[PDB]
CSV table of C-alpha atoms and ligand atoms in Angstrom, one decimal:
chain,number,residue,atom,x,y,z
A,21,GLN,CA,32.8,19.6,-14.2
A,22,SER,CA,32.5,16.0,-15.4
A,23,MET,CA,32.3,12.2,-14.6
A,24,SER,CA,32.8,8.9,-16.2
A,25,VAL,CA,30.7,5.8,-15.7
A,26,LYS,CA,31.1,2.5,-17.7
A,27,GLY,CA,33.1,4.4,-20.3
A,28,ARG,CA,30.5,7.2,-20.8
A,29,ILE,CA,31.1,10.8,-19.9
A,30,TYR,CA,28.6,12.9,-18.0
A,31,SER,CA,28.7,16.6,-17.4
A,32,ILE,CA,27.3,17.9,-14.1
A,33,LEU,CA,24.5,20.5,-14.1
A,34,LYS,CA,24.1,20.7,-10.4
A,35,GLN,CA,24.1,18.8,-7.1
A,36,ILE,CA,20.5,17.7,-6.1
A,37,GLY,CA,21.2,15.6,-3.0
A,38,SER,CA,24.0,15.2,-0.5
A,39,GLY,CA,25.3,13.1,2.4
A,40,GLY,CA,28.5,12.4,4.4
A,41,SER,CA,30.3,10.4,1.6
A,42,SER,CA,27.4,10.6,-0.9
A,43,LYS,CA,26.1,13.0,-3.5
A,44,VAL,CA,23.4,13.0,-6.1
A,45,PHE,CA,24.0,15.1,-9.3
A,46,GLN,CA,21.8,16.1,-12.1
A,47,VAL,CA,23.8,15.5,-15.3
A,48,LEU,CA,23.8,15.3,-19.1
A,49,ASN,CA,25.4,12.7,-21.3
A,50,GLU,CA,27.0,12.7,-24.7
A,51,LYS,CA,23.6,13.0,-26.4
A,52,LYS,CA,22.3,15.8,-24.1
A,53,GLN,CA,19.9,13.5,-22.3
A,54,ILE,CA,19.4,14.3,-18.6
A,55,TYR,CA,20.0,11.8,-15.7
A,56,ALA,CA,20.6,11.7,-12.1
A,57,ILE,CA,23.8,10.1,-10.9
A,58,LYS,CA,24.4,9.0,-7.3
A,59,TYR,CA,27.9,8.8,-6.2
A,60,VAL,CA,29.0,6.9,-3.0
A,61,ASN,CA,32.5,7.1,-1.6
A,62,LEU,CA,33.4,3.7,0.0
A,63,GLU,CA,36.7,4.9,1.7
A,64,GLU,CA,35.4,4.4,5.2
A,65,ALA,CA,32.7,1.7,4.6
A,66,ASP,CA,33.0,-1.5,6.6
A,67,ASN,CA,32.0,-4.9,5.2
A,68,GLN,CA,28.6,-4.9,6.7
A,69,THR,CA,27.9,-1.5,5.2
A,70,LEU,CA,29.3,-2.5,1.9
A,71,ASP,CA,27.1,-5.6,1.8
A,72,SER,CA,24.0,-3.5,2.7
A,73,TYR,CA,24.9,-1.3,-0.4
A,74,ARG,CA,25.3,-4.2,-2.7
A,75,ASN,CA,22.1,-5.7,-1.6
A,76,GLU,CA,20.1,-2.4,-2.1
A,77,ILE,CA,21.6,-2.2,-5.5
A,78,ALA,CA,20.8,-5.8,-6.5
A,79,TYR,CA,17.2,-5.3,-5.5
A,80,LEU,CA,16.9,-1.9,-7.4
A,81,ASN,CA,18.3,-3.5,-10.5
A,82,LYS,CA,16.0,-6.6,-10.1
A,83,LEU,CA,12.8,-4.8,-9.3
A,84,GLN,CA,13.0,-2.6,-12.3
A,85,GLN,CA,11.5,-5.3,-14.6
A,86,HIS,CA,8.5,-5.5,-12.2
A,87,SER,CA,7.2,-2.0,-11.8
A,88,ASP,CA,7.5,1.4,-13.5
A,89,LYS,CA,6.8,2.9,-10.1
A,90,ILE,CA,10.3,2.1,-9.0
A,91,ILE,CA,13.0,4.6,-10.1
A,92,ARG,CA,14.9,3.5,-13.3
A,93,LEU,CA,18.5,2.5,-12.9
A,94,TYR,CA,20.2,2.3,-16.3
A,95,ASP,CA,23.7,1.6,-15.2
A,96,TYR,CA,26.2,1.4,-12.5
A,97,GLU,CA,29.9,1.2,-11.9
A,98,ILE,CA,31.3,-0.1,-8.6
A,99,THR,CA,34.9,-0.5,-7.4
A,100,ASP,CA,36.5,-0.7,-4.0
A,101,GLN,CA,36.6,3.1,-3.8
A,102,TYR,CA,33.2,4.2,-5.0
A,103,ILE,CA,29.8,3.6,-6.4
A,104,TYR,CA,28.2,5.4,-9.3
A,105,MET,CA,24.6,4.8,-10.1
A,106,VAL,CA,22.9,6.2,-13.3
A,107,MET,CA,19.3,6.8,-12.9
A,108,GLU,CA,16.4,8.6,-14.5
A,109,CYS,CA,16.2,12.2,-13.0
A,110,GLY,CA,13.0,13.2,-11.2
A,111,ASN,CA,11.7,16.7,-10.7
A,112,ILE,CA,11.6,16.8,-7.0
A,113,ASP,CA,11.0,14.5,-4.0
A,114,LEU,CA,7.7,14.2,-2.3
A,115,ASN,CA,8.8,15.6,1.0
A,116,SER,CA,10.2,18.9,-0.5
A,117,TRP,CA,7.1,19.2,-2.7
A,118,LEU,CA,4.7,18.7,0.2
A,119,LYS,CA,6.4,21.4,2.3
A,120,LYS,CA,6.2,23.8,-0.8
A,121,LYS,CA,2.5,23.1,-1.1
A,122,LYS,CA,-0.5,24.8,0.6
A,123,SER,CA,-3.3,22.5,-0.7
A,124,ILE,CA,-3.3,19.4,-2.8
A,125,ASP,CA,-5.7,18.6,-5.7
A,126,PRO,CA,-7.8,15.6,-4.5
A,127,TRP,CA,-7.2,13.9,-7.9
A,128,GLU,CA,-3.4,14.4,-7.6
A,129,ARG,CA,-3.5,13.1,-4.1
A,130,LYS,CA,-5.4,10.0,-5.1
A,131,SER,CA,-3.1,9.5,-8.0
A,132,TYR,CA,0.1,9.6,-5.9
A,133,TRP,CA,-1.5,7.2,-3.3
A,134,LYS,CA,-2.1,4.7,-6.1
A,135,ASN,CA,1.6,5.0,-7.2
A,136,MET,CA,2.9,4.5,-3.7
A,137,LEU,CA,0.6,1.5,-3.2
A,138,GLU,CA,1.8,0.0,-6.4
A,139,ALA,CA,5.5,0.4,-5.7
A,140,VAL,CA,5.3,-0.8,-2.1
A,141,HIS,CA,3.2,-3.7,-3.2
A,142,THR,CA,5.9,-4.7,-5.7
A,143,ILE,CA,8.6,-4.8,-3.1
A,144,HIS,CA,6.4,-6.8,-0.7
A,145,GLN,CA,6.0,-9.5,-3.5
A,146,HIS,CA,9.8,-10.0,-3.4
A,147,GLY,CA,9.8,-10.3,0.4
A,148,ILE,CA,11.0,-6.8,1.3
A,149,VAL,CA,9.5,-4.7,4.0
A,150,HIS,CA,10.8,-1.2,3.9
A,151,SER,CA,10.0,-0.4,7.5
A,152,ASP,CA,11.1,3.2,7.2
A,153,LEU,CA,8.9,4.8,4.6
A,154,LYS,CA,8.6,8.6,4.5
A,155,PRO,CA,7.9,11.2,1.9
A,156,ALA,CA,11.6,11.5,1.0
A,157,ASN,CA,11.6,8.0,-0.3
A,158,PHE,CA,9.3,9.0,-3.1
A,159,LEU,CA,10.2,11.0,-6.2
A,160,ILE,CA,8.0,12.9,-8.7
A,161,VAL,CA,9.0,11.9,-12.2
A,162,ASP,CA,6.6,12.9,-15.1
A,163,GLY,CA,3.8,13.5,-12.7
A,164,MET,CA,4.1,10.0,-11.3
A,165,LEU,CA,5.6,9.0,-7.9
A,166,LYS,CA,8.4,6.5,-7.9
A,167,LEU,CA,9.9,4.7,-4.9
A,168,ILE,CA,13.7,5.3,-4.8
A,169,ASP,CA,14.9,2.9,-2.1
A,170,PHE,CA,14.2,-0.3,-0.2
A,171,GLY,CA,15.3,0.4,3.4
A,172,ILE,CA,18.1,-2.0,3.0
A,173,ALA,CA,21.3,0.1,2.6
A,174,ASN,CA,22.7,1.4,5.9
A,175,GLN,CA,21.6,5.1,6.4
A,176,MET,CA,23.7,8.2,7.4
A,177,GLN,CA,23.9,12.1,7.7
A,178,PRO,CA,26.3,15.0,6.9
A,186,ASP,CA,15.2,19.8,2.4
A,187,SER,CA,15.7,16.9,4.9
A,188,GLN,CA,14.1,14.0,7.1
A,189,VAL,CA,16.1,11.0,8.4
A,190,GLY,CA,15.9,9.3,11.8
A,191,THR,CA,12.4,10.9,11.9
A,192,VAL,CA,9.8,9.2,14.0
A,193,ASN,CA,6.5,10.7,12.7
A,194,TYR,CA,5.9,7.7,10.3
A,195,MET,CA,7.1,4.9,12.6
A,196,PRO,CA,4.6,2.2,13.3
A,197,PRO,CA,3.7,1.2,16.9
A,198,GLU,CA,5.2,-2.3,16.6
A,199,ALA,CA,8.6,-0.8,15.4
A,200,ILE,CA,8.7,1.0,18.6
A,201,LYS,CA,7.9,-2.0,20.9
A,202,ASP,CA,10.7,-4.1,19.1
A,215,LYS,CA,7.3,-8.1,14.9
A,216,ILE,CA,7.8,-6.3,11.5
A,217,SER,CA,5.5,-7.4,8.7
A,218,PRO,CA,4.3,-5.8,5.4
A,219,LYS,CA,1.6,-4.2,7.7
A,220,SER,CA,4.3,-1.9,9.1
A,221,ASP,CA,4.7,-0.2,5.7
A,222,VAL,CA,1.0,0.3,5.7
A,223,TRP,CA,1.0,2.4,8.8
A,224,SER,CA,3.8,4.7,7.3
A,225,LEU,CA,1.9,5.1,4.0
A,226,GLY,CA,-1.1,5.9,6.1
A,227,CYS,CA,0.9,8.6,7.8
A,228,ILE,CA,2.0,10.0,4.5
A,229,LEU,CA,-1.6,10.0,3.2
A,230,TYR,CA,-2.7,11.8,6.5
A,231,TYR,CA,-0.1,14.5,5.8
A,232,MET,CA,-1.4,14.9,2.3
A,233,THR,CA,-4.9,15.2,3.6
A,234,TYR,CA,-4.7,17.2,6.8
A,235,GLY,CA,-1.4,19.2,6.3
A,236,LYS,CA,0.3,17.4,9.2
A,237,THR,CA,1.3,13.9,10.4
A,238,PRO,CA,-0.9,12.3,13.0
A,239,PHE,CA,1.4,13.0,16.0
A,240,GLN,CA,3.1,16.1,14.6
A,241,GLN,CA,1.8,18.4,17.4
A,242,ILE,CA,3.4,16.4,20.3
A,243,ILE,CA,6.8,18.1,20.4
A,244,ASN,CA,8.5,15.9,22.9
A,245,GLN,CA,9.9,12.8,21.2
A,246,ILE,CA,9.3,10.5,24.2
A,247,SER,CA,5.7,11.8,24.6
A,248,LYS,CA,5.4,11.2,20.9
A,249,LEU,CA,6.6,7.6,21.0
A,250,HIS,CA,4.3,6.9,24.0
A,251,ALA,CA,1.3,8.4,22.2
A,252,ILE,CA,2.0,6.2,19.1
A,253,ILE,CA,1.8,3.0,21.0
A,254,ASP,CA,-1.0,4.1,23.4
A,255,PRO,CA,-4.5,2.8,22.3
A,256,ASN,CA,-6.1,5.1,24.8
A,257,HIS,CA,-4.8,8.0,22.7
A,258,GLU,CA,-7.3,8.6,19.9
A,259,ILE,CA,-6.1,9.8,16.5
A,260,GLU,CA,-8.2,12.7,15.2
A,261,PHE,CA,-9.7,12.4,11.6
A,262,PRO,CA,-11.5,15.7,11.1
A,263,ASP,CA,-14.5,15.3,8.7
A,264,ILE,CA,-13.8,16.0,5.0
A,265,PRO,CA,-15.9,15.7,1.8
A,266,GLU,CA,-14.2,12.5,0.7
A,267,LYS,CA,-15.5,9.9,3.1
A,268,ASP,CA,-13.5,7.1,1.4
A,269,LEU,CA,-10.2,8.9,2.2
A,270,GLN,CA,-11.1,9.3,5.8
A,271,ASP,CA,-11.9,5.5,5.9
A,272,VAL,CA,-8.5,4.7,4.3
A,273,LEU,CA,-6.7,6.7,7.0
A,274,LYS,CA,-8.7,5.1,9.8
A,275,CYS,CA,-7.9,1.7,8.3
A,276,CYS,CA,-4.2,2.3,7.8
A,277,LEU,CA,-3.7,3.7,11.2
A,278,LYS,CA,-4.8,0.8,13.4
A,279,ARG,CA,-2.2,0.3,16.0
A,280,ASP,CA,-2.8,-3.5,16.0
A,281,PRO,CA,-1.1,-4.8,12.8
A,282,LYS,CA,-3.6,-7.7,12.7
A,283,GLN,CA,-6.4,-5.1,12.6
A,284,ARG,CA,-4.6,-2.9,10.0
A,285,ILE,CA,-5.7,-3.1,6.4
A,286,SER,CA,-3.3,-4.7,3.9
A,287,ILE,CA,-1.9,-3.5,0.6
A,288,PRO,CA,-3.9,-5.9,-1.6
A,289,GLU,CA,-7.1,-4.6,0.3
A,290,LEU,CA,-6.1,-1.0,-0.1
A,291,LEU,CA,-5.8,-1.5,-3.8
A,292,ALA,CA,-9.5,-2.7,-4.0
A,293,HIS,CA,-10.7,0.1,-1.7
A,294,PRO,CA,-13.4,2.5,-3.2
A,295,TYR,CA,-10.9,5.4,-2.6
A,296,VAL,CA,-8.7,4.1,-5.4
A,297,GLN,CA,-11.3,2.4,-7.5
A,298,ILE,CA,-14.3,4.6,-7.7
A,299,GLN,CA,-14.6,7.5,-10.2
B,1,LIG,C1,16.1,18.4,-10.1
B,1,LIG,O1,15.8,17.2,-9.4
B,1,LIG,C2,15.6,17.1,-8.0
B,1,LIG,C3,15.5,18.1,-7.2
B,1,LIG,C4,15.4,17.9,-5.8
B,1,LIG,S1,15.3,19.2,-4.9
B,1,LIG,C5,16.9,19.7,-4.5
B,1,LIG,O2,14.5,20.1,-5.6
B,1,LIG,O3,14.7,19.0,-3.6
B,1,LIG,C6,15.4,16.6,-5.3
B,1,LIG,C7,15.5,15.5,-6.1
B,1,LIG,C8,15.6,15.7,-7.5
B,1,LIG,N1,15.8,14.7,-8.4
B,1,LIG,C9,16.3,13.4,-8.2
B,1,LIG,N2,16.3,12.6,-9.2
B,1,LIG,C10,16.8,11.4,-8.7
B,1,LIG,C11,17.0,10.1,-9.1
B,1,LIG,C12,17.5,9.2,-8.2
B,1,LIG,C13,17.6,9.5,-6.9
B,1,LIG,C14,18.1,8.4,-5.9
B,1,LIG,C15,17.8,7.1,-6.1
B,1,LIG,C16,18.1,6.1,-5.2
B,1,LIG,C17,18.8,6.4,-4.0
B,1,LIG,N3,19.1,5.3,-3.3
B,1,LIG,C18,19.8,5.3,-2.1
B,1,LIG,O4,20.3,6.3,-1.7
B,1,LIG,C19,20.0,4.0,-1.4
B,1,LIG,C20,19.6,4.2,0.1
B,1,LIG,C21,21.4,3.5,-1.7
B,1,LIG,C22,21.7,2.8,-2.8
B,1,LIG,C23,23.0,2.4,-3.1
B,1,LIG,C24,24.0,2.8,-2.1
B,1,LIG,F1,25.3,2.4,-2.3
B,1,LIG,C25,23.7,3.4,-1.0
B,1,LIG,C26,22.4,3.8,-0.8
B,1,LIG,C27,19.1,7.7,-3.8
B,1,LIG,C28,18.8,8.8,-4.7
B,1,LIG,C29,17.3,10.7,-6.4
B,1,LIG,N4,16.9,11.7,-7.4
B,1,LIG,N5,16.6,12.9,-7.0
């Protein structure tokens, strides 16, 4: 099987992602270099949808200059029928990798944290708030994490999380949305990387779950662990009041990412 994009031919090794109307393929080009290609069929896309796509793409293409913790987009072709995006290929996404994993090296955890902070900080500096961060938004590429999307393109549905509520901040439920909202969600991802679950994972009922998330009389548990700085990061990211919640520039100066 094969594909053409801006005049260059790519052979398909396998499919590494799917969707109703979208696929991601691992591929090789004419020089035997490997890449990932996202394909989007526009057949049934309305104008608002289309504009959400073009906006996500414009941002990806822009923000590439600004951080190597954003996935590399080398090229794209777009027509009225489809989109093809040629990207660097990662090894696996963070969600899949977390599920495959029984314990995480503290050093590796701290290193991924920093990467996530950096990428999210970068989008905040261009006025983007993702507001739906989750492990699937991050990709392992050469033992670094890279953010792959900005929360702008309309989402859909045909390893998997989407419409999930476990990372949703309290003020997204009540609904205002600020950069602080993305801190909660990163906080939830860090908590999963620390304790093996998300902070409200055990509450099965979705409505009970949402109620617990906004209820300040519901205490979140932070079992003691040998890295006290990690435990303080979690406590600080997961304040329900956004005005109380630590900020990204603060988290980047925190002893958890700075010390040793
Ligand atoms: C072998 O590699 C693997 C394996 C396994 S797996 C199956 O092991 O779990 C898993 C992963 C990999 N690799 C991989 N490499 C890459 C590179 C890039 C992307 C990627 C990048 C950006 C997006 N962006 C969007 O979808 C956004 C929302 C968008 C943008 C424009 C639109 F028109 C519409 C939507 C989507 C996908 C994903 N992967 N995934």
